[PDB]
């Protein structure tokens, strides 16, 4: 009686009237989406001189001049931030000073909360670290991508860099399979690379786009996707923005390739593994368009449109969406340096005030399917899921 993945032909973007406002946010350039959120908190790099500071807001406390807790410690700018998939109080930052820091928030986060000491300080990268991504199935496992081309895999529990793989060119993105076994990354040589950390080897590589500007990837397996499939954005030979779907088991040519538009910003792909919604967002763009990956086919659905550029952004976890509103996803959009603007993505339904059960398959839960020790033994237990209801 599990709810199956819905076909979504209609999905509209609704900007909230409410905002997180009177903030002091960074507008520095990075190679990541810029923000992070879990079911409770929002992380946003703060506009400060000197070492990077993360503002920590409560998702629920929307409005003017909200309580902003502070995470310091960094000695340079923050390049990437990600909350743990499992532990509400745990997050990681990647920093220009080459250090990845693991943070543990207090039980009660207030406007006077200040974090200076990480619970784990992961050292060794030779240049600025550009990504820090948690394994979606395994507790304590993190991948970090370095400007020097190194992907470093960490067991944060043991403070152990247990595997590393170095490419010749700088990393531009790094993302985990929903199976938790493989990492995909893009590099400046226009390559999409597949990495097996437990084998410490590159198990696939292909030229993914022929233009010069930055390619970005994410996995599109999981519940709604297809096993071993990866999605890329990039630029064609004429510098048009385009995308491709790749099968890592038949990794010589795209399964699917299409032009998107003639924009200039690299596009960050965001996959909702539970419904198959696939958002492509460019920093500096005033619009965001989305597709559904369903039945192995990609279909255009709709787009968010505004007259205000996206400076930074992130999406909230599935567990956090408002089910009674038929909300399936939500973007937090930084506008200028002082506002976070929520955007709901809603399936239009006649009865806008009753639970649309068919829209909510079992969502990724906040429980790891494997311990690190189990994973290193070669296990591949599918992620744990929870059927959420209001």
Automatic annotation (TrEMBL):
BP terms from Gene Ontology: actin filament organization
Disulfide bond entries: 281-288
WD repeat feature ranges: 71-105, 122-164
Alphabetically ordered keywords of this record: Coiled coil, Repeat, WD repeat
Domain DUF1899 stretches: 7-63
Superkingdom as given in the UniProt entry: Eukaryota
GO molecular function: actin filament binding
UniProt keyword annotation of Repeat present: yes
Entry protein name: Coronin
Organism (species): Toxoplasma gondii
Whole-protein residues included: 3 to 392 of 621
């Amino acid at each position: 009686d599990a709810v199956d993945v819905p076909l979504i032909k209609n999905l509209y973007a609704e900007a909230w009237k409410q905002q997180y406002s009177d903030l002091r946010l960074s507008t520095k350039q990075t190679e990541s989406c810029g923000l992070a959120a879990n079911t409770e908190y929002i992380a946003a790099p703060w506009d400060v001189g000197g070492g990077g500071v993360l503002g920590i807001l409560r998702l629920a406390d929307i409005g003017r001049n909200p309580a902003v807790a502070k995470i310091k410690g960094h000695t340079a700018s923050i390049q990437d931030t990600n909350f743990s998939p499992f532990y509400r109080d745990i997050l990681a930052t990647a920093c220009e000073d080459t250090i990845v820091r693991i943070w543990q928030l207090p039980e009660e986060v207030t406007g006077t909360t200040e974090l200076k000491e990480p619970i784990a300080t992961l050292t060794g990268a030779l240049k600025k670290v550009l990504s820090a991504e948690w394994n979606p199935a395994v507790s304590g496992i993190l991948a970090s991508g370095c400007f020097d081309g190194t992907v470093a895999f960490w067991n944060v529990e043991k403070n152990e860099n247990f595997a590393s793989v170095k490419f010749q060119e700088s990393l531009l993105s790094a993302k985990w399979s929903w199976k938790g076994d493989l990492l995909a990354c893009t590099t400046k040589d226009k390559a999409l690379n597949i990495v097996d950390p437990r084998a410490a080897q590159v198990v696939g590589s292909v030229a993914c786009h022929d233009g010069s500007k930055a390619c970005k990837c994410t996995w599109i397996d999981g519940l709604a996707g297809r096993d071993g499939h990866v999605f890329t954005t990039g630029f064609g030979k004429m510098q048009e923005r385009e995308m491709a779907i790749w099968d890592t088991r038949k990794f010589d040519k795209p399964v699917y390739h299409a032009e998107i538009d003639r924009g200039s910003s690299p596009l960050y792909p965001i996959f909702d593994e539970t419904t198959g919604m696939l958002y492509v967002c460019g920093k500096g763009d005033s619009s965001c368009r989305y597709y559904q990956y369903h039945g192995g086919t990609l279909r255009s659905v709709d787009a968010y449109r505004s007259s205000v550029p996206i400076k930074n952004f992130c999406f909230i976890p599935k567990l956090a969406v408002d089910q009674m509103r038929a909300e399936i996803g939500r973007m937090l959009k930084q506008e200028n340096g002082n506002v976070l603007q929520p955007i709901s993505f809603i399936v239009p339904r006649k009865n806008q005030d009753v639970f649309q059960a068919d829209l909510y398959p079992p969502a990724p839960d906040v429980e790891p399917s494997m311990t690190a020790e189990e994973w290193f033994k070669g296990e591949n237990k599918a992620i744990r899921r929870r059927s959420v209801k209001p």
